[PDB]
Design a protein around this motif. Structure first.
Motif, mmCIF file in Angstrom:
data_model
loop_
_atom_site.group_PDB
_atom_site.id
_atom_site.type_symbol
_atom_site.label_atom_id
_atom_site.label_comp_id
_atom_site.label_asym_id
_atom_site.label_seq_id
_atom_site.Cartn_x
_atom_site.Cartn_y
_atom_site.Cartn_z
ATOM 1 N N UNK A 4 0.820 -1.188 0.000
ATOM 2 C CA UNK A 4 0.000 0.000 0.000
ATOM 3 C C UNK A 4 0.874 1.265 0.000
ATOM 4 N N UNK A 5 1.948 1.250 0.793
ATOM 5 C CA UNK A 5 2.886 2.365 0.834
ATOM 6 C C UNK A 5 3.494 2.630 -0.549
ATOM 7 N N UNK A 6 3.929 1.565 -1.208
ATOM 8 C CA UNK A 6 4.574 1.715 -2.510
ATOM 9 C C UNK A 6 3.571 2.118 -3.584
ATOM 10 N N UNK A 7 2.342 1.602 -3.509
ATOM 11 C CA UNK A 7 1.280 2.055 -4.416
ATOM 12 C C UNK A 7 1.079 3.573 -4.301
ATOM 13 N N UNK A 8 0.987 4.043 -3.053
ATOM 14 C CA UNK A 8 0.881 5.469 -2.777
ATOM 15 C C UNK A 8 2.082 6.251 -3.300
ATOM 16 N N UNK A 9 3.285 5.710 -3.094
ATOM 17 C CA UNK A 9 4.535 6.401 -3.440
ATOM 18 C C UNK A 9 4.643 6.732 -4.932
ATOM 19 N N UNK A 10 4.113 5.859 -5.791
ATOM 20 C CA UNK A 10 4.260 6.075 -7.239
ATOM 21 C C UNK A 10 2.933 6.356 -7.965
ATOM 22 N N UNK A 11 1.832 6.444 -7.220
ATOM 23 C CA UNK A 11 0.515 6.608 -7.837
ATOM 24 C C UNK A 11 0.181 5.424 -8.743
ATOM 25 N N UNK A 12 0.428 4.216 -8.240
ATOM 26 C CA UNK A 12 0.260 3.008 -9.047
ATOM 27 C C UNK A 12 -1.193 2.802 -9.464
ATOM 28 N N UNK A 41 -8.334 -6.224 -0.964
ATOM 29 C CA UNK A 41 -9.006 -5.551 0.147
ATOM 30 C C UNK A 41 -8.179 -4.337 0.570
ATOM 31 N N UNK A 42 -6.870 -4.529 0.716
ATOM 32 C CA UNK A 42 -5.989 -3.457 1.160
ATOM 33 C C UNK A 42 -5.893 -2.294 0.162
ATOM 34 N N UNK A 43 -6.100 -2.603 -1.119
ATOM 35 C CA UNK A 43 -6.035 -1.605 -2.201
ATOM 36 C C UNK A 43 -7.345 -0.896 -2.521
ATOM 37 N N UNK A 44 -8.441 -1.329 -1.895
ATOM 38 C CA UNK A 44 -9.750 -0.698 -2.110
ATOM 39 C C UNK A 44 -9.743 0.836 -2.040
ATOM 40 N N UNK A 45 -9.054 1.436 -1.035
ATOM 41 C CA UNK A 45 -9.011 2.909 -0.979
ATOM 42 C C UNK A 45 -8.408 3.571 -2.222
ATOM 43 N N UNK A 46 -7.610 2.824 -2.986
ATOM 44 C CA UNK A 46 -6.979 3.343 -4.187
ATOM 45 C C UNK A 46 -7.731 2.948 -5.451
#
Ligand SMILES: Nc1nc2c(ncn2[C@@H]2O[C@H](COP(=O)(O)OP(=O)(O)O)[C@@H](O)[C@H]2O)c(=O)[nH]1
Ligand SMILES: Nc1nc2c(ncn2[C@@H]2O[C@H](COP(=O)(O)OP(=O)(O)O)[C@@H](O)[C@H]2O)c(=O)[nH]1
Ligand SMILES: [Mn+2]
Ligand SMILES: [Mn+2]
Lengths: 342, 342
Positions: B255-263, B281-286
């Motif tokens: 989740x941190x790395x998804x946030x870091x690069x706008x994945x 489930x963890x990526x739902x907010x994105x």
């Protein structure tokens, strides 16, 4: 007190007695160079229903080997040193590099399993030394300090095989136990009029096959062959005739050597065919006889051959090589030796 | 014409694909240093009822590896070169030293047997190289001339394991076959909105046991661990958390790395548990998803991870290490990577 520099313990886990002694000379040199006390190995016998471990001191004198480098018996190490210096949790196996998960696998196979089983040792992790520049041809102190690594444990002897010429003189420090020495003296006194020729006849079925595989074009060292042909065979080519002399050649050469020294008896050590009747026929003109031990005890045979007025060995055999080195180095001056086909 | 300097052929006979590639980089360097043509190895798969050999060119491009050193395919060697250059009679096995009669024993066990069987090779004698000063960390030409020794054959890769930092850049010359590249491109285009994070989840039962054995006091390299902690771990201590992250830690870090690069998507390669539902489930907010191949093809997975906008690997895994080296070296500039717990 124990040795603050720590210990080395190893299995002479390759080959029979001649191979084990050959690597043990290199290990003695290695331990001295590392300034660690060497745990004296159990030697290994295979001619039984199961692999059998023989304490060092049954065969050789601890006092004499100690004149070369610091040593302790396996019994002292196992009963007095190991429990506090090297408890199960820090028993790491040492090997060159991971081998086919990848690691040392120090207890798989025979005699690897039975050797460490005998002293109730199991390993809990691995340490590698292949990345040390120069390997074991003495960074080791830098990589393995005594505090964390009180005991370096090797399932394969950390020594070359066949042995290098540089360590052959260490045989000076392998002196037969008093029991073996006395057995040899008694056999000589009772049976062998002096001067006597002792011969090693290596002739079991597996041996003749080893010799028949010799590739004379590549002429590489084979086992102990550098003991008669020099390092890398600079003095000549290893032949089948040297590795496995014919019965005719054995007889001719024994008779020649008997004549050369005015021998009054012959001693024969063999793994299989002592050729007693055949040698006796050949010796009739000299009115002397060949004699063997019954049964043939390998260690007492080695000791007798080391005491002979003249030894004729097998140049390829590492068992003969024990005798050659003892005759060269045990005393202040070498005692004479020769080899079949040389 | 054939190479007047001769050939090297070997079995990548230790471990699975990451281990085989790790040693292959060292062998490439060794062949170039010896100025002999390298026979490209068959790689080895174990996840079948029997061991399976995979031709080099099924996985990688011959043209690209040839830009590093002279090479021939196993097919060319086997069909065109071997019959006249290296007939059965001169097929010698090469190894460090005799091992427990003493010799190389190059075809005992698995995959040693099946590998050489596959190319109809049996050995008729042994050559040793342990006495060469410096070993294979490049006398070899002096000891093994091309005329008598047209082919040096090694049942164990003549290369360090784990690989040394010095050979990691050779991964530049391992370029996925066009078939694999295209499969990777298609999966990305169809499934993975860019930029995408690719993650390697090494989590089978045997792995967690490997990690649980970590001795943090001795802190030795374990497999590929120097790829994140430096040579001899100069940058830190290898922990269980790095070797085998908890599910919680995996999710938090993805989740941190998804946030870091706008994945816009996540790719997961795994040996066992891809954690797709848990990651989703963890990526739902994105409002993005994790995706995997079904089934998970190891080579296409490696290729996809090499193409990712960001790779998060397992520092201990040599499989992750393939990806790290490709990302570091395939192009003119490195593509970014990270590791769990670092
Ligand atoms: N008893 C007896 N056993 C022998 C003799 N020679 C070779 N052997 C046996 O076969 C073995 C040799 O293999 P090793 O000593 O390693 O010698 P090589 O095999 O001769 O290098 C020797 O330990 C004994 O067990 C001998 O003269 N007497
Ligand atoms: N398919 C697939 N198999 C994997 C993955 N990761 C580890 N494996 C399998 O387990 C193996 C690894 O052992 P090796 O690659 O030597 O890597 P390490 O064992 O991870 O150093 C790998 O070749 C595949 O066979 C993955 O992401 N996918
Ligand atoms: Mn032998
Ligand atoms: Mn592995």
């Amino acid at each position: 007190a124990t040795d603050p520099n720590g210990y080395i313990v190893f299995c002479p886990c390759m080959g029979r007695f001649g191979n084990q002694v050959d690597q043990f000379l290199g290990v003695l040199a290695f331990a001295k160079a590392l300034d660690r006390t060497l745990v004296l190995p159990n030697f290994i016998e295979f001619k039984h229903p199961e692999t059998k471990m023989i304490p060092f001191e049954f065969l050789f004198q601890v006092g004499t080997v100690a004149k070369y480098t610091r040593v302790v018996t396996m019994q002292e190490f196992t009963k007095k040193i190991m429990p506090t210096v090297w408890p199960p949790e820090k028993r790491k196996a040492f090997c060159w590099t991971p081998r086919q998960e990848p690691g040392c696998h120090s207890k798989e196979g025979n005699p690897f399993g039975p050797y460490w089983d005998q002293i109730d040792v199991s390993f809990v992790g691995d340490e590698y030394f292949g990345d040390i520049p120069g390997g074991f041809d003495l960074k080791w102190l830098e990589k393995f300090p005594s505090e964390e690594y009180p005991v370096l444990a090797f399932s394969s002897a950390p020594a070359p095989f066949p042995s290098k010429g540089k360590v052959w003189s260490i045989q000076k420090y392998l002196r037969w136990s008093s029991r073996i020495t006395e057995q040899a003296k008694k056999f000589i006194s009772a049976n062998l009029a002096k001067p006597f020729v002792a011969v090693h006849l290596r002739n079991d079925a597996d041996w003749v096959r080893v010799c028949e595989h010799i590739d004379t074009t590549t002429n590489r060292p084979l086992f102990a062959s550098e003991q008669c042909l020099g390092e890398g065979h600079h003095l000549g080519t290893l032949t089948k005739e040297i590795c496995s002399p014919s019965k005719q050649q054995i007889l001719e050469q024994i008779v020649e050597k008997v004549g050369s020294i005015g021998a009054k008896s012959v001693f024969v050590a063999s793994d299989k065919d002592h050729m007693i009747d055949e040698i006796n026929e050949a010796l009739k003109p000299y009115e002397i006889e060949a004699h063997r031990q019954e049964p043939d005890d390998m260690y007492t045979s080695l000791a007798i051959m080391g005491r002979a007025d003249l030894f004729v060995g097998n140049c390829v055999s590492t068992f003969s090589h024990i005798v050659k080195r003892e005759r060269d180095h045990a005393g202040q001056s070498p005692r004479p030796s020769a080899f079949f086909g040389i």
